[PDB]
């Protein structure tokens, strides 16, 4: 690894610095030398790492629907030939996306989740890994559609079966967990009424749960409640 | 597209 | 050239495809590529080459000023040691952004000004030298500081005197040219009432040539002419 | 930061 010779705590500094400078492929290759280095991740450290690698697979995913839009229009009756150019090159993006998503699963797999015994670590990186095998379903195709299906469905399983026995019902990360096991209900398991009760039952047990909560918790799981009503508005 | 965090 | 085997063609509709998918290093690559090629760039090739460098060194020197800014800050009094990182971490994105100069610097070398004939073109080719030294001379600090800024004036005044020549005063190149000459005035020369004249100049001559454009050239020409206006404004 | 193009 590139950075093997540098230190833990370096390299947490500088995914820090890559944030605020919005570099975000620099801040995902600092955070995979920090994980390589062995330790347990804290709070903070989860959260840099999934800040870097969503913002750059969120980049790799935006190209990726504009070049597909392009490719299917290409497709259509009408369209003029314009050779193998569009579907190559959707198809380069599309395989440095399926690295991004391989590298992160390989980091929850050697060894993060493994290591991680408490609930708010191990909820954080099985919804990481539903997450991740949710960015390989969007642009599967193949024999191996279904099985990276049921791998997302399984880690967000998995999550939600701890988060419900371990976290309160506002737990930011149990709402997160939620809203985007809901969005692979709907978006990837053709499943909407699934995905719509699921954000309706997480929101309404938050909502019965604010009161327990200081103003700044409040904010927190109020942002994420937002979320969950703003797809329920988009879906209903 | 939906919101996801 | 990792680009070598691609057809100069498929190079150029994947630049398009890389812009409309807002991936601008793709774009510069493919455009890398296609001038590798040999051939002479149309006028629309020269600002696809020109838009993906443009917003690849674009990122990085809005990095680095962020890195640049949190270094001087913690070289203040008062400021605690935070060891290497930041100063490393600037460094390296400098080093980055000075490839893609060196890179772009190239490529006008290895053969696009030579063979540059026509006033659009050669002058074109100019600017760009003179805005990727620009670049070079917003990170210098050593030996060859003035050498840098030089050959960034040298580039721009070769420019300036082809346009003035060959050009309308409302040519959209000659007016961007003389833009992006006025702010190398101002900020890196240390030439501000230079830099006010030269926009002052450049923006009365356009006005008075407006009267012979089109509807479609008289945008092009006032969109700029509003550039000039606004750092006017900026700076008195 | 000023305009450039
Ligand atoms: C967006 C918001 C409010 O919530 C979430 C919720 C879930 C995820 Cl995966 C990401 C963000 C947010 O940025 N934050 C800041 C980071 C916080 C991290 N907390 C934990 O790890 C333990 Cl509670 C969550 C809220
Ligand atoms: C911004 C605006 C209006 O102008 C400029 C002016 C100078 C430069 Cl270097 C870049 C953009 C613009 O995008 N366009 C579109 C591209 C056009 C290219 N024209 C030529 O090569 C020959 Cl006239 C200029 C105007
Ligand atoms: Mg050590
Ligand atoms: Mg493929
Ligand atoms: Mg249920
Ligand atoms: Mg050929
Ligand atoms: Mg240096
Ligand atoms: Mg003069």
């Not at chain 1, 490719?71 to 579907?87: A, I």
């Not at chain 1, 015994?117 to 191996?144: I, N, P």
Request: net charge negative; aromatic share 8%.
């Amino acid at each position: 690894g590139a950075m093997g010779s540098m230190e833990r705590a370096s390299l947490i500094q500088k995914a820090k610095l890559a944030e605020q400078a919005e570099r975000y492929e620099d801040m995902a290759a600092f955070m995979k030398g920090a994980v390589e280095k062995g330790e347990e991740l804290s709070c903070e450290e989860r959260n840099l790492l999934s800040v870097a690698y969503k913002n750059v697979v969120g980049g790799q995913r935006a190209a990726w629907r504009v070049l597909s839009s392009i490719e299917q229009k290409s497709n259509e009756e009408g369209s003029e030939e314009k050779g193998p150019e569009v579907r190559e090159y959707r198809e380069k993006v599309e395989t440095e996306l399926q690295g991004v998503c391989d590298t992160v699963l390989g980091l929850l797999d050697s060894h993060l989740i493994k290591e991680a015994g408490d609930a708010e670590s191990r909820v954080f990186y099985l919804k990481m890994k539903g997450d991740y095998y949710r960015y390989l379903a969007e642009v599967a195709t193949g024999d191996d559609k279904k099985r990276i299906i049921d791998s997302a469905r399984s880690a967000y399983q998995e999550a939600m079966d701890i988060s419900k026995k371990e976290m309160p019902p506002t737990n930011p990360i149990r709402l997160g967990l939620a809203l985007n096991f809901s969005v692979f209900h709907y978006e990837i398991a053709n499943s909407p009424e699934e995905a719509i009760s699921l954000a309706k039952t997480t929101f309404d047990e938050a909502m019965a749960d604010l009161h327990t909560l200081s103003e700044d918790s409040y904010k927190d799981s109020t942002l994420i409640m937002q979320l969950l009503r703003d797809n329920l508005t988009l879906w209903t | 597209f939906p919101a996801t965090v």
